[PDB]
Ligand binder design. Structure first.
Ligand SMILES: O=S(=O)(Cc1ccccc1)Nc1ccc2nc[nH]c2c1
Ligand SMILES: O=S(=O)(Cc1ccccc1)Nc1ccc2nc[nH]c2c1
Ligand SMILES: O=S(=O)(Cc1ccccc1)Nc1ccc2nc[nH]c2c1
Ligand SMILES: O=S(=O)(Cc1ccccc1)Nc1ccc2nc[nH]c2c1
Ligand SMILES: O=S(=O)(Cc1ccccc1)Nc1ccc2nc[nH]c2c1
Ligand SMILES: [Zn+2]
Ligand SMILES: [Zn+2]
Ligand SMILES: [Zn+2]
Ligand SMILES: [Zn+2]
Ligand SMILES: [Zn+2]
Ligand SMILES: [Zn+2]
Lengths: 323, 323, 323, 323, 323, 323
């Protein structure tokens, strides 16, 4: 079958000048995210709960209200769990469904199931509601350049349901949404009418955000096949510093360090990885000090870190997509 | 209900009187089937071939033109074969997609891949071009009563792609279409919005027709869980003989002869049966004398047996559906 | 390289004469069974229910009132199901637990979980309340002969929990207690202190009673490796018939006619067969006409068919042990 | 062009006249097989035993003394068992190795592991010393016709090691030589230098003799894709009886009653069957009375049944190969 | 609720002052341990051997003399190996067996099977005779406080058999006792009478000691969900040293160096990890220099290193359990 | 089963004195390797191409022209791929084929399948043409010592076919040759006549060379059970620097630094690892900058870096082999 699944190994970015970096900082507003994107997600939203549904509708509405021509799919499936059968729904948002190639941004939108311990509620502020909102604030900041789309390439956003275990982390109790999605795409022909290629082959790179929002994260190099693109993240971070385009930020503790981790952490990327999709995994090591506590809330977030990461990220999408 | 997947076990048919049987004998014509439903499907149509596309467009068009509100689904997927990657397309036809339960009729519409041996072209007339044409005819002859649907139970037809092996019969080279749809159905919630039940649960019974069109066929009783529904066929056959609505037919050359065998044959029922679906398997034993030869063609069919079979089956479906 | 797990292949019976065939027929009370062993078990007793614990107490108490030295064990375990984790309990009854070899009688004591269709309650009278009671009637009727055991050979009874599916028959929704117990016997040293042999290797023959109680049952002959013990049953039947020790019985309608089936019927035997245990499987084909309906009750049972099989089976066992 | 694995679907015999049949008939010697081929095999020969090396040597020595250009090969491998790691050797003997297609005849040559019960030694006369002898007498009796082989087709012979279990029949304790050899042939290119076909595709048909030599055998017809070759066997037995070329033989106790089956019997054909090879399985139902007893010895063989079957089979083979 | 398995996620220690830390230090003797707990283990004890029954008897006796209320269970099973079927026996010693939650400490008590290279005998002093004596020394020194137990939480000890490969490390040749025991616990309702939780859910934290006793060991921090418990270890090691309670101890060569390691090391925790149990894995990297040689003996042990570790570990256990 | 598989764990090196360590430096020619061994291999040689047959023939011809007497075998096999069934051929070179034990050197010889991007052809200079030529220079630069073999230890070379994925990396699409050859060795008794041991038991240490040729490579230490042999590399390296036998080499730019990675990195060692062969894996992290681009050519290799590696690797082998 034709060889376009080769193209990703050759793709190169389109680097921005100093005047165009400045524009991007001005383009992005954390407090608008904080109020209109982030806060309506800080709620109990484990799979099947009335919060899951509220959260899915809020995410849909914030996207529909943009100009860029986004196509939305709800992917609804039944799976077995320790508490029996349950239904889940991944949310998928695509620009130019027909293009063979897509850069993919992903996170998970469910929150881990718990009882109401010490009369509190778990709402996973780093895990992973901030990541969702940064995705929502990216589509809005760049809705202008993203509309200039009506190398055959576009953009895609995935919001997984069921990342967390219900009872005890095992292969059969975790990653419900990503295991189903990776298989579905492996067996769907792409582009439409193709005879020998699939939607997976169409994934250019998968950028997974997990556990973002705490102060002083450090993100390692996990994989040697995406090393060259993690390196671009460094150089983007370092240049926006010397232009003092970031806040409360220092070059002595940079977010993207130069030390490969070696092993891997279990997460939504795994069913994609083992079928040959390239992955850039933006999960910090160590895990926030609040990980899986009633104190992963709005109060412990750190407004400045998030605002820096929104900026670097927004540039990487823009240079990858030659926009 | 929670609940309702229980009902198929207690369903009981609405047996028809002598006046009505006569009505339906008169209501179907085998000569119409032959010219407009069968002969267009006597063609080379192995997966991915031009005739596969043409077999599909015909089957669609014959249905698109009836009264009853049939909903057509095209299930197009990518699998691996001994020759590499290939695309298949199953055809599904449904009255009242929302009903919890559907009685299901099915066959395979691919022909088997062969070189052109002796300058002849294999076209599978019993295997399975007739079967498609009997299902096509049936929906035409009862379009009348089937439209009355506008015991929460309606009717579905399935036309599989890729039942035959490409090179050598094995678990990875066979039943490409049935193995896809079973998995898709078992992981889809039914009825829309359900939490603990699936489309697979909604399959009241599966009647798979295969290898049909030769004279003096004999079909054994394959499974002890659908046994009673096969006794029905025996008694529908024995009441059209005595009424004189069958042709060139005797009660010593009967088609359904309470026998056993008593083991199992591999076919499109296998991936449904191993997840708990009840099966009525309408495949003869022995196979037709012409099985898999260049002489399994139009000339070797028997007009009479196919007309008889049509009559019995059109009965069964009306008595099953209480119409 | 030991040794004894082969003794079971050379084993021969020690046949009874006419006067012992008459004594055996007069020592068993079809009336005593029906009231003291069977009727207490015709209730709703699906896994986890109040009825399950009541059936376990009835079975244990009836066995304890006997003089023979029966040793009883409760094998309680945890398993996943379509509705979640749940607890199950098999019942094991063994004479001479230390012996190397044991003949095994077995059936399942649960009832299938149904809703109350037409304000009725499923109780599974042939499925399998009667085989439970036949097992209790054999232990009573022969109590005098069996307390003589104090070849290294003896007798065991097993009553499985969780034989039926909870929702839809699959490999993961069926045969809960037999899949569990087989894995546990395969991994247990037998006899005590042994270095290279297991309890599973000590099962001489597994005689599984299922779906018994209706009149005119035809029991097929399933496996080549256990054929000669089926042939014992035929001759036993025939020579009791021909001393007038049977009732409402004709040689023209025997229970054990020879008739090879060839394939399998899913059941509690499957996890032991798969490991090389020889199986004598007493399940008729076709299934009782009342199978998985609310008329599987006391009023459709056949007193005399049952009484006849209690006699055949007691003769079989006494020959198997030389008693 | 390759492609050529379909040519076994279209192959047809060359039937021999009444004069060629008296020719074959007078051509075999049942006492010279008995003397020189069978008797040296009636010894203990479980795998790794000295009888195993002695048996392997007599088989090869007897083949090597014929004129036909027989190529001998020894397939020695290691494998894990209930008593630990052990070494086995299959014997493969082939005419025209370069030919794309071969008709295959086979049995197993090991005898089952037992201890000396009652001071006797198990030799498996029917199981399977006689089939071994039949294969050798066939290759001598037809030596001058096969020497003519110099349709691209010829003849292969196979003797398997490690068929029987050591301790308890299971997927890992049984069929050691056949499970090895099937996976080897499926991963060897054939013919030499071929790019997309394998030695397994060149097996035209697998003819597996097992448990033969007892009087009055009844052989089923197990598979639909070889039923036309069961037929030919049925017809060869009929013609030979009507020319009075059989002995002590009755058309009422004919070996090939057409009644069928049913399901399956595990044997050396299963690793090949499961991958698409057609099989004519000449195991009888039921098994001899002496099956797996110390009485499966020379005395209980029936000379006349074997002689008759020798003749039938050599006529089957000559007609398969057009000689 | 039925939700208690979430409790261990919220558990916090009760941190001891400096005069309680001084009592702990004074409360443990390395020479009593050396003479009465360690030395009798420095023998040959691979599975099945006389030294294995002797180490079992010594472990049980030394616990049976303490005042605390330990319940001892011997878990004995069969398994297949490169040499055939063999019997194994784990050792489980439990306080308050009815309590829902248990902090678990563990090592393997077998020794690796070797020939006597150079007329010397392999006794695995670090591998793992020392870890066993550390566990016995801790039960003795904390005996009076462990007596308080009579937060539903107590203490359990596990000695695994069959950790080493007999022949070549493979999924089937290694971790014989721990794979058996994790599967057993996973299917055992806990607490007694429970309906949807297991003994495996009861394990609060699995602290696994292995390859201990050589000088200057570096333990990494392998897992993100047990990392807050690794930090407790470092804090304990820092305080004891600045109070002057360590020996021959440098804060430039502290045992717990917050350096992380992504590559898993296979060991007895793996069957628990993959079912969701949190692990604090105390194995050093690199392995000791003497690893799997005849020089892993008593003279190459370092007295001071082991005495420091006893003290760090008993402080852990008291702060975990609030004594 | 004998004990000799233990011998590898005790084996120790026989180190060289400053003066033999110059004889090595001086007996290897980077310029002869570059022209006579490398350049012939810098062509398109993906599996089945004309370039693959020619690279077999180069490799063999170079080895056949040397005094030591190497035994060559060509291991051909058939496997399924994303484009269909294909033929592949490993190259295996052994001294003393019958010795119990062998040290093993290896790489892959196939070149990744790519379309001709920008009119350029992928030839994989580091991936892995240079590892091939390195293995060719070593046998030549040492031909004279290795002829003293005619401690049951010798040397083996292995050049795999089919390492790269044809389309997308996955367990079914990568490592065709290694997966195939580890299974064949595990099922081959070694030495000849052996009853309990395999060819795979004989592999002392597997040293896999991959992705070599770039400047300034950093090779990590992957596995605790092969660490002692990496320390030998690190030490060999440092004394060659001190003696001045190294070019363009510093100590801050050490090839073998103290660096512990997580592990894997999929490659040809995986299928051996899962069966317990110990592995020395000489692949760097990060991968070279040119990896899987058209600039992985002759111009971007570094002569010094490769010359220095030839010197280390050659010492290591003579020290390992006591030559
Ligand atoms: O800790 S994990 O490796 C899962 C695991 C695997 C094995 C044993 C115990 C736990 N990964 C993980 C867990 C929770 C998360 N929440 C957000 N991202 C998460 C990622
Ligand atoms: O028919 S079965 O093969 C179950 C089955 C198999 C395949 C598909 C769907 C259902 N065996 C069965 C069913 C009910 C029973 N009650 C007592 N013994 C029973 C045995
Ligand atoms: O009976 S079998 O199906 C194997 C089996 C299957 C399941 C359980 C126990 C045994 N076939 C078999 C057994 C022994 C033979 N000896 C010569 N040919 C033989 C064929
Ligand atoms: O990157 S790898 O871990 C394989 C992989 C795994 C998952 C996804 C994509 C690719 N190993 C690898 C790749 C290329 C090589 N070329 C020479 N040796 C190589 C080894
Ligand atoms: O080295 S391991 O990772 C196992 C292994 C994995 C792959 C190949 C060969 C061996 N773990 C191991 C080995 C020996 C031990 N002795 C005590 N604990 C031990 C742990
Ligand atoms: Zn989380
Ligand atoms: Zn067909
Ligand atoms: Zn039932
Ligand atoms: Zn046998
Ligand atoms: Zn060890
Ligand atoms: Zn590569």
């Amino acid at each position: 079958a034709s060889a376009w699944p080769e193209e990703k190994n050759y793709h190169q970015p389109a680097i921005l000048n100093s005047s165009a970096l400045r524009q991007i900082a001005e383009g992005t507003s954390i407090s608008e995210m904080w109020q209109n994107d982030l806060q309506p997600l800080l709620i109990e939203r484990y799979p099947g709960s009335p919060g899951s549904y509220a959260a899915r509708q809020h995410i849909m509405q914030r996207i529909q209200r943009l100009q860029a021509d986004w196509v939305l799919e709800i992917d609804t499936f039944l799976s077995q769990t320790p508490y029996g059968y349950r239904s889940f729904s991944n949310i998928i948002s695509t620009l130019n469904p027909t293009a063979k190639r897509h850069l993919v941004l992903a996170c998970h939108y469910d929150s881990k199931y718990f009882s109401h311990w010490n009369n509190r509620v778990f709402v996973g502020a780093t895990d992973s509601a901030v990541p969702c909102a940064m995705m929502l604030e990216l589509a809005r900041a760049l809705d202008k350049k993203l509309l200039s789309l009506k190398p055959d390439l576009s953009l895609q956003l995935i919001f997984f349901d069921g990342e967390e275990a219900f009872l005890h982390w095992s292969p059969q109790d975790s990653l419900y949404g990503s295991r189903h999605l990776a298989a579905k795409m492996a067996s769907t022909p792409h582009p439409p009418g193709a005879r020998g290629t699939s939607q997976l082959h169409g994934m250019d790179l998968l950028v997974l955000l997990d556990l973002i929002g705490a102060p002083n994260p450090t993100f390692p190099n996990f994989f040697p096949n995406s090393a060259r693109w993690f390196e671009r993240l460094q150089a983007i971070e370092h240049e926006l510093h010397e232009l003092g385009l970031l806040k409360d930020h220092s070059l002595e503790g940079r977010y993207f360090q130069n030390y490969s981790y070696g092993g891997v952490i279990q997460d939504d990327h795994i069913p994609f990885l083992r079928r040959g999709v390239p992955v850039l995994h933006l999960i910090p090591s160590p895990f926030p000090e609040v990980w899986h506590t009633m104190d992963d809330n709005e109060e412990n977030l750190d407004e400045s870190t998030i605002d820096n990461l929104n900026k670097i990220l927004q540039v990487f999408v823009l240079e990858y997509l030659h926009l």
